Design an enzyme around this catalytic site. Structure first.
Site, PDB file in Angstrom:
ATOM      1  N   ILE A  21       0.847  -1.203   0.000  1.00 31.71           N
ATOM      2  CA  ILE A  21       0.000   0.000   0.000  1.00 31.71           C
ATOM      3  C   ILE A  21       0.884   1.255   0.000  1.00 31.71           C
ATOM      4  O   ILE A  21       0.665   2.147  -0.815  1.00 31.71           O
ATOM      5  CB  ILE A  21      -0.985   0.035   1.180  1.00 31.71           C
ATOM      6  CG1 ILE A  21      -1.887  -1.199   1.232  1.00 31.71           C
ATOM      7  CG2 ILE A  21      -1.798   1.323   1.133  1.00 31.71           C
ATOM      8  CD1 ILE A  21      -2.779  -1.249   2.462  1.00 31.71           C
ATOM      9  N   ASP A 139      -1.747  15.735  16.528  1.00 30.94           N
ATOM     10  CA  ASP A 139      -1.426  15.735  15.096  1.00 30.94           C
ATOM     11  C   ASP A 139      -2.628  15.414  14.199  1.00 30.94           C
ATOM     12  O   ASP A 139      -2.512  14.684  13.248  1.00 30.94           O
ATOM     13  CB  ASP A 139      -0.260  14.799  14.809  1.00 30.94           C
ATOM     14  CG  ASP A 139       0.451  15.116  13.508  1.00 30.94           C
ATOM     15  OD1 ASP A 139       0.400  16.260  12.978  1.00 30.94           O
ATOM     16  OD2 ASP A 139       1.084  14.174  12.997  1.00 30.94           O
TER      17      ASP A 139
END
Length: 342
Positions: A21, A139
């Site tokens: 991926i 984040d």
């Protein structure tokens, strides 16, 4: 062992049929067929044992994701590693396969108001749980919001997370910071270490703005440019807001700037739902003390069709890795992953 692009990806026998991926923080990510639960899953290879800081981020995030159990937070399904510390050179984290993330989605797909509303609801539902555990993500951004083919959203990437510590939040002007620039609240650049919940709400506000236009709202090219993007839109802070900044370098910097007027939200986002813009305004409030909290955002009229506090669970209990040598961190990572061994 399984190989993917000439690197060992050693996850069998349970996980077969590997497809590359991409790339995570300390290694390769692949999809794979879970031969037990008959579904394809995501598997991240992690190789942090050489670096104290890689070890710290890896332990922190395993500890957090194993403690958390929430529909809108990515779980850990399984963890693959060697049976002994001596033979453990990598760790593989198995997670639900999520088709895409909000980053990828936004660079090609227009979002309906209904999608924006649903996604914002799920982000805030997950964040309510995180904050209820006395944790800051620190984040939040589109690439850290995973989505599957039915648009279930799950927050991931707790590598920069911290336990809240509002009493020790204060710092000097232009104090360095690790979390992703475009989503950083203004106070990070002025007087804040990012140890308060309001840091996350700012990020969610930036994500909301981004969902409304498919472009980041504050694309700063460097540390200080980020503050100047924010002020170009919110306008000059009020005297009262300036009065809450005691640090002189920070306050004098703001005072040195030409007066800037506020850009109205409905001119910036002319097709946005007016209730969306009201909530956006309250999330992108300059003064962190006046910024809306997660629970109040959930209760905002924009989210009225989803709001249900009885179905917005909190953590059963709230949550010193800084000095630990890598050797002790590896040992804690070993212990922390032991529950997944045969």
């Amino acid at each position: 062992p399984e190989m993917v692009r000439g690197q060992v990806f050693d996850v069998g026998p349970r996980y077969t049929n590997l497809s590359y991926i991409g790339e995570g923080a300390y290694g390769m990510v692949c999809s794979a067929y879970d031969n037990v639960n008959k579904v394809r899953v995501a598997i991240k290879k992690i190789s942090p044992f050489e670096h104290q800081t890689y070890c710290q981020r890896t332990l922190r995030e395993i500890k957090i994701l194993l403690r958390f159990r929430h529909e809108n937070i990515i779980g850990i399904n399984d963890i693959i590693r060697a049976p002994t510390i001596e033979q453990m050179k990598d760790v593989y984290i198995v997670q639900d396969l999520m088709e895409t993330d909000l980053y990828k989605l936004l660079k090609t797909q227009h979002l309906s108001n209904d999608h924006i509303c649903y996604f914002l609801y799920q982000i805030l539902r997950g964040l309510k749980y995180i904050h209820s555990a006395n944790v800051l993500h620190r984040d939040l951004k589109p690439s850290n919001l995973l989505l599957n083919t039915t648009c279930d959203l799950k927050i991931c990437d707790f590598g920069l997370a911290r336990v809240a510590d509002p009493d020790h939040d204060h710092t000097g002007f232009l104090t360095e910071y690790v979390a992703t620039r475009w989503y950083r609240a203004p106070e990070i650049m002025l007087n804040s270490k990012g140890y308060t919940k309001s840091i996350d709400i700012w990020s969610v506000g930036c994500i909301l703005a981004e969902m409304l236009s498919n472009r980041p709202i504050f694309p700063g090219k460097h540390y200080l440019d980020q503050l100047n993007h924010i002020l170009g839109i919110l306008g000059s802070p009020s005297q009262e807001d300036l009065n809450c900044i005691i640090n002189l370098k920070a306050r004098n910097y703001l005072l040195s700037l030409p007066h800037k007027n506020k850009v109205p939200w409905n001119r910036l986002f002319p097709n946005a739902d007016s209730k969306a813009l009201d909530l956006l305004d309250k999330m992108l409030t300059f003064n962190p003390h006046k910024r809306i909290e997660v629970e109040q955002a959930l209760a905002h009229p924009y989210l009225e069709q989803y709001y249900d506090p009885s179905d917005e669970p909190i953590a059963e209990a709230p949550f010193e890795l800084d000095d630990l040598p890598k050797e002790k961190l590896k040992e804690l990572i070993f212990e922390e992953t032991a529950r997944f061994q045969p």
